[PDB]
Write an enzyme that holds these catalytic residues in place. Structure first.
Site, PDB file in Angstrom:
ATOM      1  N   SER A   1      -3.795  -0.702  -6.153  1.00  0.00           N
ATOM      2  CA  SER A   1      -4.056   0.607  -6.442  1.00  0.00           C
ATOM      3  C   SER A   1      -2.868   1.025  -5.912  1.00  0.00           C
ATOM      4  O   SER A   1      -1.872   0.900  -6.646  1.00  0.00           O
ATOM      5  CB  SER A   1      -5.029   1.213  -5.034  1.00  0.00           C
ATOM      6  OG  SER A   1      -5.963   0.017  -5.072  1.00  0.00           O
ATOM      7  N   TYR A   2      -2.252   2.295  -4.856  1.00  0.00           N
ATOM      8  CA  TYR A   2      -1.458   2.464  -4.283  1.00  0.00           C
ATOM      9  C   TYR A   2      -0.423   2.027  -4.628  1.00  0.00           C
ATOM     10  O   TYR A   2       0.847   2.345  -4.613  1.00  0.00           O
ATOM     11  CB  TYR A   2      -1.638   3.111  -3.303  1.00  0.00           C
ATOM     12  CG  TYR A   2      -0.171   4.573  -2.919  1.00  0.00           C
ATOM     13  CD1 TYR A   2      -0.828   5.578  -3.384  1.00  0.00           C
ATOM     14  CD2 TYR A   2       0.796   4.404  -2.573  1.00  0.00           C
ATOM     15  CE1 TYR A   2       0.229   6.805  -3.056  1.00  0.00           C
ATOM     16  CE2 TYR A   2       1.454   5.115  -3.046  1.00  0.00           C
ATOM     17  CZ  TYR A   2       1.751   6.499  -2.640  1.00  0.00           C
ATOM     18  OH  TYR A   2       2.546   7.233  -2.723  1.00  0.00           O
TER      19      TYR A   2
ATOM     20  N   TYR B   1       0.487  -0.951  -0.024  1.00  0.00           N
ATOM     21  CA  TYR B   1      -0.001  -0.061   0.198  1.00  0.00           C
ATOM     22  C   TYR B   1       1.195   1.115  -0.314  1.00  0.00           C
ATOM     23  O   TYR B   1       1.294   1.876  -0.981  1.00  0.00           O
ATOM     24  CB  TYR B   1      -0.735   0.146   1.249  1.00  0.00           C
ATOM     25  CG  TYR B   1      -1.288   1.263   0.967  1.00  0.00           C
ATOM     26  CD1 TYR B   1      -1.619   2.099   0.380  1.00  0.00           C
ATOM     27  CD2 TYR B   1      -2.657   1.114   2.482  1.00  0.00           C
ATOM     28  CE1 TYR B   1      -2.587   3.322   0.492  1.00  0.00           C
ATOM     29  CE2 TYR B   1      -3.773   2.327   2.198  1.00  0.00           C
ATOM     30  CZ  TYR B   1      -3.807   3.502   1.649  1.00  0.00           C
ATOM     31  OH  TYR B   1      -4.789   4.069   1.724  1.00  0.00           O
TER      32      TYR B   1
ATOM     33  N   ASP C   1     -13.131  -0.384 -14.836  1.00  0.00           N
ATOM     34  CA  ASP C   1     -12.552   0.695 -13.266  1.00  0.00           C
ATOM     35  C   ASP C   1     -12.799   2.220 -14.060  1.00  0.00           C
ATOM     36  O   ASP C   1     -11.967   2.420 -14.215  1.00  0.00           O
ATOM     37  CB  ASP C   1     -10.996   0.544 -13.166  1.00  0.00           C
ATOM     38  CG  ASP C   1     -10.521   0.018 -11.740  1.00  0.00           C
ATOM     39  OD1 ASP C   1     -10.538   1.258 -11.013  1.00  0.00           O
ATOM     40  OD2 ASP C   1      -9.802  -0.558 -11.275  1.00  0.00           O
TER      41      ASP C   1
ATOM     42  N   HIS D   1     -12.861  -2.076  -9.519  1.00  0.00           N
ATOM     43  CA  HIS D   1     -11.648  -1.014  -9.396  1.00  0.00           C
ATOM     44  C   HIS D   1     -11.460  -2.640  -7.826  1.00  0.00           C
ATOM     45  O   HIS D   1     -10.358  -2.174  -7.189  1.00  0.00           O
ATOM     46  CB  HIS D   1     -11.580   0.124  -8.187  1.00  0.00           C
ATOM     47  CG  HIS D   1      -9.553   0.312  -7.954  1.00  0.00           C
ATOM     48  ND1 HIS D   1      -9.022   0.600  -8.862  1.00  0.00           N
ATOM     49  CD2 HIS D   1      -9.612   0.267  -7.288  1.00  0.00           C
ATOM     50  CE1 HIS D   1      -7.943   0.656  -8.665  1.00  0.00           C
ATOM     51  NE2 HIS D   1      -7.927   0.471  -7.061  1.00  0.00           N
TER      52      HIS D   1
END
Ligand SMILES: Cn1c(=O)c2c(nc(N3CCC[C@@H](N)C3)n2Cc2ccccc2C#N)n(C)c1=O
Lengths: 730, 730
Positions: free
Chosen positions: B594-595, B511, B672, B704
């Site tokens: 994600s990140y 993350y 997404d 997503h």
């Protein structure tokens, strides 16, 4: 002792040469030599400079192409080329005055032209811009607007919409200058009710919000674009502000429901030949129309209608063949299926005849590929009659007066090296160049029509020959196997020191679509070469049912039901190859692009257990997703009233479950305007819902060809590694 | 002797239980037991049936959720739930009359409602439909339209637009009933100038032409949606046809340029607290506004302004913390960074004070996670102070009158099993339930606020305990390493019979985004479990710079320059892990979503040579492509006048070349709406142009989250095999 590396293929190390000429008269032609356009005299090597290393470099490195007017007084310089679909594209142009020795700079032509072309005689130009037709009687003179109804993705004047461009005319052009250049005939398409497909384009990473591209695209059974045909009198232009084009209305036996414009062909300057097709290509009409001097109108009398039909499947290979008229335009010869289903040549009279409109000039169990020229006494054509090899191409000729005086002009020549010929005759057929694509390295020779004396050798790939000497090139076998008592040809690319005692992995290359042919006698340096030369893999293709130029019995075998026999037979072909011995039953793959990617997929999903893995690149996954013209031609309309059932019983995703027994690789262009992606997205989805694992790869912003340099190299390297993993190599 | 199979994970075989109650009063709560809503008496087990196995099955199997009015006279039945973004969604509703014992069927509510909620007292309902606010003073009574300006993807009344929903309020709701339910406050968003993003949706394979979905989405630096705040007097409704809402205008020190609406909080019925934020979250203002009985207007006097600022980076963790007011609303407590950068609690007076507005109630090198309740004499909160474990969560309480009387209520309890607590106090805090998510199996107990006497055990996962006995569960170590003289925590999932002498492959879970925390003391049964229990792989996470609740010095370390230190530190963490011994230096991977997928990618592309392979799922590839609110909060505006340079020097594709030394797996949802895909498409593209080979996978029509069942199973199975291939297992 070097193998043929994937790099050799990708970087195109071993160049294959050719001789692409442009006949300028019945005895001279043009040839590009070291960026210099030369004029050669067929008969003697007599050459001469037409355009220098120079001229081209003014517009520098962006000179895309050139077009010389027929009076050779001017030259068209194309630059700033920008693709758009298979054939469409927009460029910028400049006219070069050969005589005045400089670039015409007065009435220039629009810096974003869609299409342009000289007349057939003078220096008359007709071009399309912003979807409208413009004419210029002379390079120095001003433009004359012909149409004003043009509108982006709605009204097309003089150019085809997406579907016509791809499935009908094979090009962007929808213009036709009459001989003696009086009239200019064009077609006009209204896409108004045609649905839209919208895919995303990402462009440079600097583009924050990705663009969106829409296209009026008719999927099977949807609303098709409409057509209208016009002929405008070019000679008047100077005496008016606007000229009123005259329109030809298609024949009644077609105007009842959707239909198409097959082909346009000028006969004489007061006669033109148009071919029409019903949406259900079960029926087609070719009207001949005459100009009325007195009422200034074109008539297309039912008396000169001429009907072509098919109770077996559909008309023509991909559309009715083009007619070839005599000087006096009294009669014409055209390729049509005979009583046995063999595409041959037969004579027609301008007027129709009650169930006797023809008289075949060619008989046999082989077909005429294409008519090449019609002399006052001879008809030159090209067939696959020789050695009963449907995969071969040879140039024949028949004396009109005596349908017996039929002699082959390329059969003899070099039987060892050449079995696949390309032709090109001078304006009136006094000479003719030959293109040997045959088994061995391509050989381009030019002959004198009179007695066939080979004047000289234009190009023998001696250079390439000298280079392949130091490399272990593989061989290519071209034979046929026989099922249910019928010859079915195939071709295998055998690796270097092929030893029939050992066992090799097998890869099937596929197309297998209607009237397709992968098993032919042509020379090629492709990926399959690396696969054989360096990975020692046997690459094979098999032309099964519904295919090639072996007669309708075979081709129409698929009619109304794709995803059937062509698939099965592709499997049997592998069975047969195994029974041949030299194939490792535990390492047999299969891959295909487009239609091939379909079959590939349909095969991997058949649960035949014969294949271990495969690769499908931009495959069609279900016929509803594909364009109307192509699809319906074989499948009909996806409606309960017609053939809906067969559309549904041939979905790739319906065979998802059976994909557990296979390693699968699905690939697709992100900007595929031809085979939408939806097609693959729908497949992946299906497999995922089935719990089946597979391998995928998308190519950002690539066409249906993934042909950009970087992407081209990338995808093959990838597939290679996929095969390596699958075949336990690497 | 059974390991924890991937199936165990995917099919959720070992169920982890919990006790989710709903306090109805200061002494009773609701609990779902075998599809029966029960009413429990906190103090004695005294139970009782509130709603039967029955009632729910009328609408059959589609009863999504229920909501009981606060007078417990009616119940809301949600059904026909349809997702739309993280929190948004539309359902259908029916009101059940507990007393009359039947479903109200008169003035029903719209069969496509966007949002609904009871008041805080009566049976007042406020709902949003077709983007407009409607009110019903009573379940039986007719609807009263409050707004009419509503319009799809343009004007939002009472609900948030895409960005506000995701980055600001964390929910779809934009309604706020005042206490004693007189007024109803709501926000209204105009997306008018916000750009659109349009991605394709494919749906069933029966859909011939794929749909297209557009969304007003502001990417970094683009035009943001605008806001307005209103309060409407609900009591009048019956006496008019239309009622005119009164509007509160944000504070001047914010209305000069773009800005946001942080939070809304009712104090007393004549006082409301609004928090505003500048587009550059360097500054924020929290105005307190009072109702004027006489002029029927709300005033927000600068005297009660209250400013929050940050010279280090930005305000709050993800936005200014919510204020907590006293009964008389004279003072309020709020979480803010102290002089040392530690998020603590401090008192404020309604009126502002010149550079003295605060007085901290909490000091130290740890932070208050969240205020949980404010009594007349006590303040209950939750911090990570205990055992100096920033990864731990405990429930503390302070006596207002005596800021010394600070006692921890969960520290003691079960120190072996619990270090991560969740809380839930009854209306006025007479009782309080505890949620032990701690190291061991979750333990839910309920206590009596008075003396903390643990009344009883609500749920001990005894059952799950009994099942894990027969399985080789892995262990979880939670320690910290130290760099440049600072504690940096991490956590490792050690496989079964972990032997410090052997060597294991390492996988980093990431993350690493601002204020993220992967290293905590919570119990979890995830993919990493299978990876350790069955593949004998060590799964580790490391909270480095710019992160967790360890003070701003660490968190803001990343300010204005993402893709820097958080990435590097993720590498050092692997270095350190190697120096620990038990890790096979030749088999270390890393993946993220994600990140995390970003960092993962940025790491694989650093050319540190420390990692062998990795997986990025729906990664951000360059900050311009991400939404404004989030991105700008740390990156500023992508303009030469601000921080454009740092936006450009942190592109994943700019590190393409360095991907040759790695096996990479890129995955992305086709639908997404959060991380557009453009992001990955842009990456792939880059790698292709670099000549780098990698592995990709797209998920047709997935969010997503790629959270559908089929897809969820699919993607993990795939990643598993990817690791198996990479780690030479399988
Ligand atoms: C690995 N990981 C994350 O990266 C993550 C996350 N929660 C968030 N956010 C907090 C709420 C608002 C939301 N827009 C951002 N992010 C960051 C993020 C960055 C880029 C694109 C999408 C996202 C998302 N959702 N979680 C839980 C997580 O595990």
């Amino acid at each position: 002792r070097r193998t043929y590396t994937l790099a050799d293929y990708l970087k195109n190390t071993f160049r294959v040469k050719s001789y692409s000429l442009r006949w300028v008269s019945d005895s001279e032609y043009l040839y590009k030599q070291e960026n210099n356009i030369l004029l050669f005299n067929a008969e003697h090597g007599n050459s001469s400079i037409f355009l220098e290393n120079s001229t081209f470099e003014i517009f520098g490195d962006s000179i895309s192409d050139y077009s010389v007017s027929p009076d050779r007084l001017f030259v068209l310089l194309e630059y700033n080329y920008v693709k758009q679909w298979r054939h469409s594209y927009t460029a910028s142009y400049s006219i070069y005055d050969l005589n005045k020795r400089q670039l015409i700079t007065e009435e220039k032509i629009p810096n974003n032209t869609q299409w342009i072309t000289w007349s057939q005689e003078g220096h008359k130009l007709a071009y399309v811009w912003k979807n409208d037709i413009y004419v210029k009687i002379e390079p120095h003179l001003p433009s004359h607007r012909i149409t004003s109804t043009g509108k982006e993705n709605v009204i097309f004047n003089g150019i085809n919409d997406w579907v016509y461009e791809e499935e009908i005319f094979g090009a962007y052009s929808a213009l036709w200058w009459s001989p003696n250049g009086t009239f200019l005939a064009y077609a006009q398409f209204n896409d108004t009710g045609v649905p839209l497909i919208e895919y995303s384009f990402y462009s440079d990473e600097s583009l924050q919000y990705p663009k969106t591209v829409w296209i009026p695209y008719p999927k099977a059974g949807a609303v098709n674009p409409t057509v209208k045909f016009f002929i405008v009198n070019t000679d008047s232009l100077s005496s008016t502000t606007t000229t009123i084009p005259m329109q030809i209305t298609a024949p009644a036996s077609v105007t009842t429901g959707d239909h198409y414009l097959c082909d346009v062909a000028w006969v004489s300057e007061d006669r033109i030949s148009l071919q029409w097709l019903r949406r259900i290509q079960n029926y087609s009409v070719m009207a001949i129309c005459d100009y009325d001097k007195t009422t200034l109108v074109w008539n297309c009398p039912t008396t000169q209608e001429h009907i072509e039909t098919s109770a077996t499947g559909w008309c023509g290979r991909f559309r009715p063949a083009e007619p070839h008229f005599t000087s006096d335009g009294s009669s014409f010869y055209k390729i049509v299926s005979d009583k046995d289903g063999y595409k041959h040549i037969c004579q027609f009279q301008k007027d129709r005849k009650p169930e006797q409109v023809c008289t075949f000039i060619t008989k046999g169990a082989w077909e005429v590929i294409s008519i090449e020229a019609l002399t006052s006494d001879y008809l030159y054509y090209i067939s696959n009659e020789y050695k009963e090899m449907p995969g071969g191409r040879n140039l024949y000729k028949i004396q009109l007066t005596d349908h017996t005086n039929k002699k082959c002009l390329s059969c003899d020549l070099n039987p060892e090296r050449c079995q696949y010929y390309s032709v090109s005759l001078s304006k009136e057929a006094k000479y003719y160049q030959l293109g040997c694509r045959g088994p061995g390295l391509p050989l381009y020779t030019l002959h004198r029509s009179t007695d066939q004396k080979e004047l000289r050798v234009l190009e023998d790939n001696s250079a390439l020959d000298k280079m392949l000497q130091d490399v272990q090139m593989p061989s290519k076998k071209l034979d046929f196997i026989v099922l249910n008592e019928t010859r079915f040809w195939y071709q295998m690319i055998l690796p270097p020191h092929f030893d029939k005692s050992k066992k090799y992995p097998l890869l099937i290359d596929v197309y297998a679509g209607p009237c397709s042919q992968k098993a032919d006698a042509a020379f090629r340096l492709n990926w399959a070469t690396y696969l054989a030369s360096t990975e020692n893999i046997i690459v094979a293709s098999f032309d099964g049912r519904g295919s090639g130029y072996q007669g309708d019995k075979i081709m129409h075998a698929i009619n109304k039901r794709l995803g059937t026999l062509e698939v099965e037979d592709q499997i049997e072909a592998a069975r047969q190859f195994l029974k041949m011995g030299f194939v490792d039953s535990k390492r047999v793959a299969i891959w295909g692009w487009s239609y091939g990617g379909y079959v590939t997929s349909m095969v991997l999903g058949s649960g035949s257990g014969v294949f271990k893995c495969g690769i499908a690149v931009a495959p069609v996954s279900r016929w509803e997703y594909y364009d109307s013209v192509y699809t319906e031609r074989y499948m009909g309309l996806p409606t309960p009233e017609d053939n809906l059932d067969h559309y549904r019983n041939s979905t790739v995703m319906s065979r998802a479950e059976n994909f557990k027994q296979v390693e699968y690789l699905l690939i697709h262009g992100t900007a595929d305007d031809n085979v939408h992606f939806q097609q693959s997205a729908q497949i992946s989805k299906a497999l995922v819902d089935a719990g089946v694992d597979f391998q995928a790869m998308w190519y950002t912003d690539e066409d249906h060809g993934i042909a950009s340099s970087t992407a081209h190299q990338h995808i093959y390297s990838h597939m290679s590694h996929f095969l390596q993993q699958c075949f336990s190599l690497r």
